[PDB]
Amino acid sequence: SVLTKAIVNADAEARYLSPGELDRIKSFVASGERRLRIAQTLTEARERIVKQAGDQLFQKRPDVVSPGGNAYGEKMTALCLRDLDYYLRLVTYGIVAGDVTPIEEIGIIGVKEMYNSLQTPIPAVAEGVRAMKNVATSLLSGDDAAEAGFYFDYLVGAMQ
Amino acid sequence: SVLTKAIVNADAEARYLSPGELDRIKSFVASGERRLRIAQTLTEARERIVKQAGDQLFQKRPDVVSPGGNAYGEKMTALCLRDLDYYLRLVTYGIVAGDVTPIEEIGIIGVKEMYNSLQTPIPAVAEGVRAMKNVATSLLSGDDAAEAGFYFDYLVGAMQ
Amino acid sequence: SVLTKAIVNADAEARYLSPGELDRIKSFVASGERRLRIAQTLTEARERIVKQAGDQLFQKRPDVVSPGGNAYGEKMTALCLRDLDYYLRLVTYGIVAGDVTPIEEIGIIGVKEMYNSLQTPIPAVAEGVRAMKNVATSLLSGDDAAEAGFYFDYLVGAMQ
Amino acid sequence: SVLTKAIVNADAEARYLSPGELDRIKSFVASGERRLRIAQTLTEARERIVKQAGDQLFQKRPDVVSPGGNAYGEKMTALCLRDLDYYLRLVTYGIVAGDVTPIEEIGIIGVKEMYNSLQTPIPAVAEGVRAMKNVATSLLSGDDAAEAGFYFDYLVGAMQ
Amino acid sequence: MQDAITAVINNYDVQGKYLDGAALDKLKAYFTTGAVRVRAAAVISSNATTIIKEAAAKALIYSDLTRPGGNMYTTRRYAACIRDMDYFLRYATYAMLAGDPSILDERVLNGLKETYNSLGVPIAATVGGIQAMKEVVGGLVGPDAAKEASIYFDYLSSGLS
Amino acid sequence: MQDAITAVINNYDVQGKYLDGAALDKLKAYFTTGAVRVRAAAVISSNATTIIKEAAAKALIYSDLTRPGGNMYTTRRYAACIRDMDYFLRYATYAMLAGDPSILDERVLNGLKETYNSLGVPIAATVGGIQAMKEVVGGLVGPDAAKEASIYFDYLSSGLS
Amino acid sequence: MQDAITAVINNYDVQGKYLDGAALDKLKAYFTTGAVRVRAAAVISSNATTIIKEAAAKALIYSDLTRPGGNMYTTRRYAACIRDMDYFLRYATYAMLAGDPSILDERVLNGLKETYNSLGVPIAATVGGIQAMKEVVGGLVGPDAAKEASIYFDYLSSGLS
Amino acid sequence: MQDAITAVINNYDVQGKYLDGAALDKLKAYFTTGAVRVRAAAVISSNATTIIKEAAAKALIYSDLTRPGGNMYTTRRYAACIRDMDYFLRYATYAMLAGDPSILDERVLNGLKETYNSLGVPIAATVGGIQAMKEVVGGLVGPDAAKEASIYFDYLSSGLS
Amino acid sequence: GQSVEVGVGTLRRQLEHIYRIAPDATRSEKDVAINAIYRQVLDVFAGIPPSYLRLSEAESKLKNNEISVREFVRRLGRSENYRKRFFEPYSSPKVVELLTKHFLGRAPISQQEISTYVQILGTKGLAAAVDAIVESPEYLTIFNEDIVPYRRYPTLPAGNYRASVRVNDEELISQSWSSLSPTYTGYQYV
Amino acid sequence: SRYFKVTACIPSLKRVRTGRELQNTFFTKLVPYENWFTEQQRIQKAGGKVLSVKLFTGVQGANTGV
Ligand SMILES: *[C@H](C)[C@H]1/C(=C/c2[nH]c(/C=C3N=C(/C=C4\NC(=O)C(CC)=C4C)C(C)=C\3CCC(=O)O)c(CCC(=O)O)c2C)NC(=O)[C@@H]1C
Ligand SMILES: *[C@H](C)[C@H]1/C(=C/c2[nH]c(/C=C3N=C(/C=C4\NC(=O)C(CC)=C4C)C(C)=C\3CCC(=O)O)c(CCC(=O)O)c2C)NC(=O)[C@@H]1C
Ligand SMILES: *[C@H](C)[C@H]1/C(=C/c2[nH]c(/C=C3N=C(/C=C4\NC(=O)C(CC)=C4C)C(C)=C\3CCC(=O)O)c(CCC(=O)O)c2C)NC(=O)[C@@H]1C
Numbered sequence A, B, C, D: 001s002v003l004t005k006a007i008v009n010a011d012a013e014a015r016y017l018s019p020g021e022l023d024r025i026k027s028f029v030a031s032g033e034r035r036l037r038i039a040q041t042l043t044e045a046r047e048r049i050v051k052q053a054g055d056q057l058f059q060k061r062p063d064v065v066s067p068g069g070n071a072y073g074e075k076m077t078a079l080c081l082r083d084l085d086y087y088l089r090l091v092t093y094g095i096v097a098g099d100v101t102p103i104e105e106i107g108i109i110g111v112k113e114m115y116n117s118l119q120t121p122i123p124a125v126a127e128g129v130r131a132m133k134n135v136a137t138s139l140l141s142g143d144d145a146a147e148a149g150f151y152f153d154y155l156v157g158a159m160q
Numbered sequence E, F, G, H: 001m002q003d004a005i006t007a008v009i010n011n012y013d014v015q016g017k018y019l020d021g022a023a024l025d026k027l028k029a030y031f032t033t034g035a036v037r038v039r040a041a042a043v044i045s046s047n048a049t050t051i052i053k054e055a056a057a058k059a060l061i062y063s064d065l066t067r068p069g070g071n072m073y074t075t076r077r078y079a080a081c082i083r084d085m086d087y088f089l090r091y092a093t094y095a096m097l098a099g100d101p102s103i104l105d106e107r108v109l110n111g112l113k114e115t116y117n118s119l120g121v122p123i124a125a126t127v128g129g130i131q132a133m134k135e136v137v138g139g140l141v142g143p144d145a146a147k148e149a150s151i152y153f154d155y156l157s158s159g160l161s
Numbered sequence I: 001g002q003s004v005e006v007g008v009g010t011l012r013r014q015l016e017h018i019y020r021i022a023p024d025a026t027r028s029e030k031d032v033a034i035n036a037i038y039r040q041v042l043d044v045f046a047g048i049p050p051s052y053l054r055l056s057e058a059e060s061k062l063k064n065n066e067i068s069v070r071e072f073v074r075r076l077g078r079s080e081n082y083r084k085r086f087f088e089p090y091s092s093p094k095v096v097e098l099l100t101k102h103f104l105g106r107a108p109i110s111q112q113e114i115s116t117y118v119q120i121l122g123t124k125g126l127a128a129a130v131d132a133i134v135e136s137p138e139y140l141t142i143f144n145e146d147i148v149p150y151r152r153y154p155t156l157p158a159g160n161y162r163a164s165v166r167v168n169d170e171e172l173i174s175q176s177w178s179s180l181s182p183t184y185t186g187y188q189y190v
Numbered sequence J: 001s002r003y004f005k006v007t008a009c010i011p012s013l014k015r016v017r018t019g020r021e022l023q024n025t026f027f028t029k030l031v032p033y034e035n036w037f038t039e040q041q042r043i044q045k046a047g048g049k050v051l052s053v054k055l056f057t058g059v060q061g062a063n064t065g066v
């Protein structure tokens, strides 16, 4: 989380934490409670978000759920939805952490390589995440949505 | 009656009677002769059914026939039995009609309000009807009893 | 289906199913096995029913299969027969359902509008259905035929 | 504009434009070139029309430009003349549009409320518009004046 | 509305009497007639369009009514008249199933005379049309059904006139 | 909504296939179960008030919820909770007759979680109440009926949670 | 909504400027086009039913959509699709007379994409149908009118997609 | 809505506690302030039209807003803005009598920001107008009343911004 | 700078036309009103009812002047077609929302309003809730008997303007009334 | 169902209305029996006077078919 980031910068400089850096940590700990609520909201709506996003994705990309496509078949379609669920879980983790680092380690490093072996199209995966963002935004209040959006956007950027 | 109900639905839709609706009418007319006999049986046994049910009810609910209770006293006890008789007459009407509508208009609409003004307990009335059902069931043959039971159950459901 | 219709009426009234309604359900479940056989018979004879009805229709209406007429030409004649087949399939669905509702949603709502755009004459379509009824009646036993007739009649009524 | 009005009526009726409605559109497009010239004339004479009308209004209503009156003082008198200018601009827009709708949205809806807050007398404003009409009429040719008069009259009718 | 079964019930209810054998006999009578009625109703529903067509041909069309200055002149009026004809047929069918004339009184008959008089619709011609429908219906339903069907048609006719 | 019979029909219609023996067998299965279901439904309707009472006694009442500061505290909230309980019971009965869970999804289940979360109604307690109703219902309906009844109750519970 | 004449007026009104010759020229341009537009509109209204028929024949029918399991399968869905086609045609005609695309945005375009996505109506096929209507319309209206007509059809297509 | 008296009651009700002296003291505090508030409210109601006029003169009018291309340009927009001003005044008066800011949140403040953003109404200018009204109101009500009046005006301003 | 069509805009006004049936009114005048009743209540935005949707008996009474427009509107909510298309598919809370849009032209003002109507739907018929809305004071004030309902985006209750725009402008019905013959996702292209 | 034919006159005492209110003011109407009670109350609360009430359809003092 954020605090880890601050510590790491200090260690590189080989110095004790700067007052300004300390202040940012203080702000973060205050913000955390609000962040937890935002995460809680998405967790409760998780099942519906995934379902809605999946449908949107399949409409946007008929090919993925076609005999040629990776997603085609019940087993495969389930796996595609499971992947969407995974990314949502990662996003929630990110919001509470206040940083993308938790998200990044689990989901964004080696993602290209993994999907290329699977042969899943990366752009379609990105569209799914975008779709999830739109659903999530609607349920969230505007300010909460903006916070959540940043994490969603990062994912989309990473898988691109 | 079954027929009235079917006609009313058709008129609302502004259409001639549907085949399915017509089939139900056919079934009803065949059933009618059996239904008439069931009704006749209960009418003959009416006096005894009421008497037996009354006794059961009073055993089930000592309070109703107690100085505090509404049923207490000869005049009041007679009225309670008269009410049971009324409901039995309604049930017979229902069996011949094949529908609860005749029962419903005479007995089940405004029943709560009437009894609340009287201060008669509604649950006790329901118990009396249940008691009448048991007596009636014994006199009826099993299949006949099932038909009669439905109407008895409706009454119990209506006042609950 | 019968059951769907009953449930829907109850839900509108916000009440549990009436005894009369329950009785109709009981009758329907008993009838169902007979109904299944009637449907099975028509399915087996489907190919011949359509063929015979088509010929009758074309004799009755030379115009439809004439250079001016919509049915004229191989492609068009096939489509006309396909339509007859569709209606037969709908009728079988109706018999098992015990209600015209399944038939009605798929075939009778917007039918006028669809055929008017196509420019197909609606009365000729009705004649074809009548023709199919006559063929179907012959294969069915008398009582079975009466049941089937109701559904056939509904279709003819709807397309008028 | 004429066209907007016609479309709106058609949409309410949920129909394509009637022949009669189409004819009115045809007439309007023919009239337009004449209308453009009428508007151009008033625009050129705008400065003098406003000035002359103002003087007439002040003669007609000494009170408005009196210590009690709203118009009194240079700042206030300028604002009164600015208002007259605004209405003239609206009238020109109306003539080209062939309908009062453009005029109406900008100037006639909520006008009462606005002036009541300002405490400006509505009748005096109407007199000013009447005055402007007379000046404008003199510069315009007779037929042109009649066309312009209608728009001027509408304004006077709207605010009284 | 009311039906034969309910009519018997209602009469007993005002008396407060339990159902008796005499009452049961009336109900039994209805039950036997019922099967015939159901068959008749299905026939009428299937042939309704034709029944109206034939009846109109017999009385309404090729007449002064359809000619300019007649009550059924103009498409709107023509359509109205055939709509009314359909109503009469549908309600008569309902009455035949019910075994009771009351529905006709409650829905069709009440206020119709007054409406028609204000409109200037000719009652006698309408009655003629109803009688024509009856004749056509009689054929299709067959004799046993026809007697039952006829009474309701006659009831409508008497009400209008 | 949909029912078991219509569900089979719809599956065939999308395929465009005529009804086949395998399909017929599923329909036949439903028809046998039907009679049991009708009996169960009548039992539930008659005992509905008691079923709710017993279930509330088992889970809802004598609890923190009813105590001040609890969701079911105040008469208004108490009345709302028992109204919801009645809804669940009525719909489950409908589903049991239908033989299909779809009606529950279309009416009860859709948007309920979100509504409850905004209201602050506790879902787990509600689920507990549904499970309690199931147990009471199971007794009254009897074993054969109970199995059928249980699946719909469980479906509601799973949806809410 | 807005029209070309009002659009010019509105631009001037925000500036507060009196109408000037340059503005007048734009208005004059519209007035010349006007007569052509009126003729085109009358043509479209008379041939509307046929236009829809031809366009459907070109794209919608004889396709998987009409075949079972397709969006336009069943009479109800077929009727819905042709109703939508009519809407697009009527509004395009309105836009052509107006000389402004705004009405399309205000009535037709707003929320349509979202509605279609929830319904599962295929947008690309709908767009195809609109393009087909355009081609048919182009023929009937004639070349000068066709260019004007085409822009509104294209606007609808772009909005949906 | 809520008022000060009810707010105390509600806090006690969730605790389930009977009213206590500490609670009574808060209620007593309100009762003393009450008389002043009533007088202030009457003053505001009588001078409401003028208050709005003065505030508009101070901020809204003789400005770019009223000039063409400004939000309050055109009679319709001008009238809308003064209507909004009246709303704020009326609700602030209600809040002052109540002694609670909640009503402002429930009626005025909820969804206003979003509405304004869609409309393109400028929030800062609106806030300016509210502050102007406060100043005018302060004069009329007099000092003791002004302090009470000011907090509600400030609450509205903070909500909008 | 801002333009005339910026805030509420011009369009919403002038797309509302009060309609009053007059006894002596010619048929075509009368029908246009009738069509609009169907249009608002049953959400037939084509704006001409399909024949099967139409209620003839009620229309005949209305043309005769036997029944008021308010009564004719009550009958439409009483009718099956409404129950079929609106009540049956949707959830109890949604059904209320539709009711207010179909009747009263606005989005539900408050959660309390929603609760009351839901309670009616649960304890009494769809008809009873339809009766209540037509019986309700707000309906009477805005339309009385003679006026055909219209979209009216109110604004006096807080937030209703936003909600009303949402319900009228965006939420075009997104569910099939009929369960039968569910559409397969593919076959997009032709 | 029993139906009521009602003639009533209602005055607009609270507010002056520009649009024609003549249909609202004098309205002969057919009312469902169930609705009439509430309708009658509404006319009374308005201060309107109900000139005539008649039962168009149904039979008075009927136990069933009502
Ligand atoms: C035969 C009795 C008559 C006839 C038929 C005919 N039909 C078409 C074309 C179509 N018919 C349909 C019908 C349906 N689609 C459905 O979903 C249903 C219900 C399940 C029906 C009834 C459709 C969709 C078409 C269009 C083509 C397609 O399937 O995509 C034609 C051809 C007309 C044309 O030009 O397309 C004909 C001839 N016409 C007659 O003359 C007979 C009396
Ligand atoms: C002149 C005939 C009368 C007169 C004019 C007058 N007006 C004001 C102030 C304003 N006038 C307007 C009017 C408009 N705004 C618009 O958008 C339009 C339509 C395009 C109009 C007509 C406005 C907005 C104001 C407010 C000030 C501003 O513009 O910022 C005044 C002075 C206001 C005052 O004293 O408070 C006057 C004098 N008054 C008369 O009595 C004349 C008869
Ligand atoms: C000719 C283009 C087509 C044709 C004609 C045809 N018409 C009839 C019968 C009638 N026509 C009308 C129509 C009207 N009555 C009106 O008041 C108006 C509006 C002013 C119209 C248009 C009527 C009322 C009838 C019924 C008989 C009568 O006139 O009294 C027929 C005879 C009907 C029959 O089937 O016997 C015919 C043949 N038929 C075609 O095929 C042509 C395309």
Ligand SMILES: *[C@H](C)[C@H]1/C(=C/c2[nH]c(/C=C3N=C(/C=C4\NC(=O)C(CC)=C4C)C(C)=C\3CCC(=O)O)c(CCC(=O)O)c2C)NC(=O)[C@@H]1C
Residues within 6 Å of the ligand: F060, F061, F062, F063, F066, F067, F073, F074, F075, F078
């Ligand atoms: C005493 C005068 C009568 C009586 C009382 C009685 N009550 C219960 C059970 C409950 N009573 C309440 C009532 C309230 N909760 C509230 O929030 C309020 C308003 C502030 C009230 C009045 C509740 C919630 C319950 C449920 C139990 C609980 O505490 O959670 C019982 C028990 C009934 C049972 O069988 O369980 C009784 C006996 N009964 C009488 O006969 C007296 C006349």
Ligand SMILES: *[C@H](C)[C@H]1/C(=C/c2[nH]c(/C=C3N=C(/C=C4\NC(=O)C(CC)=C4C)C(C)=C\3CCC(=O)O)c(CCC(=O)O)c2C)NC(=O)[C@@H]1C
Residues within 6 Å of the ligand: F060, F065, F071, F072, F077, F078, F080, F081, F082, F084, F085, F087, F107, F108, F112, F115, F119, F121, F122, F125, F126, F129, I092, I093, I114, I115, I118, I119, I122
């Ligand atoms: C009782 C077991 C639990 C409980 C219930 C409770 N519910 C509400 C409010 C609502 N609940 C619903 C649910 C439905 N309404 C329907 O029509 C249907 C489908 C037929 C369902 C399932 C809804 C929509 C509401 C909101 C509106 C309304 O009340 O009708 C409350 C009130 C909460 C409040 O603060 O308003 C309560 C108490 N809550 C419990 O404590 C139990 C665990």
Ligand SMILES: *[C@H](C)[C@H]1/C(=C/c2[nH]c(/C=C3N=C(/C=C4\NC(=O)C(CC)=C4C)C(C)=C\3CCC(=O)O)c(CCC(=O)O)c2C)NC(=O)[C@@H]1C
Residues within 6 Å of the ligand: G065, G071, G072, G076, G077, G078, G080, G081, G082, G084, G085, G087, G107, G108, G109, G112, G115, G119, G121, G122, G125, G126, G129, I045, I172, I173, I174, I175, I176, I177
């Ligand atoms: C035809 C080219 C394509 C097609 C059409 C289609 N549409 C529906 C259903 C709806 N379409 C709409 C559209 C609108 N409603 C509006 O208010 C507006 C703008 C103001 C539009 C354009 C809506 C809302 C519906 C739903 C309800 C209704 O139909 O009234 C269907 C049927 C879907 C259903 O399940 O009912 C169809 C077939 N679909 C195609 O596949 C064609 C390419």
Ligand SMILES: *[C@H](C)[C@H]1/C(=C/c2[nH]c(/C=C3N=C(/C=C4\NC(=O)C(CC)=C4C)C(C)=C\3CCC(=O)O)c(CCC(=O)O)c2C)NC(=O)[C@@H]1C
Residues within 6 Å of the ligand: H060, H065, H071, H072, H076, H077, H078, H080, H081, H082, H084, H085, H087, H107, H108, H109, H112, H115, H119, H121, H122, H125, H126, H129, I006, I007, I008, I009, I155, I156, I157, I158, I159, I161
């Ligand atoms: C005046 C200080 C400023 C201003 C205001 C302004 N508002 C509108 C339009 C609307 N304002 C509202 C606001 C409310 N609705 C409510 O229910 C409440 C709470 C009680 C408020 C405050 C709404 C909903 C509208 C739109 C609906 C309507 O107008 O009836 C406008 C005009 C927009 C238009 O196009 O009409 C204006 C001008 N704008 C300014 O310039 C001032 C700074």
Ligand SMILES: *[C@H](C)[C@H]1/C(=C/c2[nH]c(/C=C3N=C(/C=C4\NC(=O)C(CC)=C4C)C(C)=C\3CCC(=O)O)c(CCC(=O)O)c2C)NC(=O)[C@@H]1C
Residues within 6 Å of the ligand: E065, E071, E072, E076, E077, E078, E080, E081, E082, E084, E085, E087, E107, E108, E112, E115, E119, E121, E122, E125, E126, E129, I056, I057, I058, I059, I060, I061, I063, I064
């Ligand atoms: C046809 C056999 C004769 C005929 C009929 C005709 N009727 C009207 C107009 C109306 N007729 C009715 C009747 C009914 N409305 C109902 O609801 C019922 C009961 C279900 C009936 C029987 C009514 C109320 C009207 C008036 C309003 C309306 O049009 O709906 C007309 C048209 C008169 C007009 O100009 O409006 C006609 C022609 N007249 C004939 O020529 C035949 C003898």
Ligand SMILES: *[C@H](C)[C@H]1/C(=C/c2[nH]c(/C=C3N=C(/C=C4\NC(=O)C(CC)=C4C)C(C)=C\3CCC(=O)O)c(CCC(=O)O)c2C)NC(=O)[C@@H]1C
Residues within 6 Å of the ligand: J011, J012, J013, J016, J017, J019, J020, J021, J022, J025
């Ligand atoms: C003025 C010359 C005389 C006068 C008028 C007066 N009228 C009312 C009340 C009403 N007047 C009408 C009349 C109409 N409404 C319409 O729609 C039409 C046709 C377009 C007319 C002519 C109506 C319906 C009413 C009742 C409700 C309303 O306000 O409209 C009153 C008030 C009566 C009361 O006590 O409320 C008055 C005073 N009265 C005179 O003294 C003048 C001779």
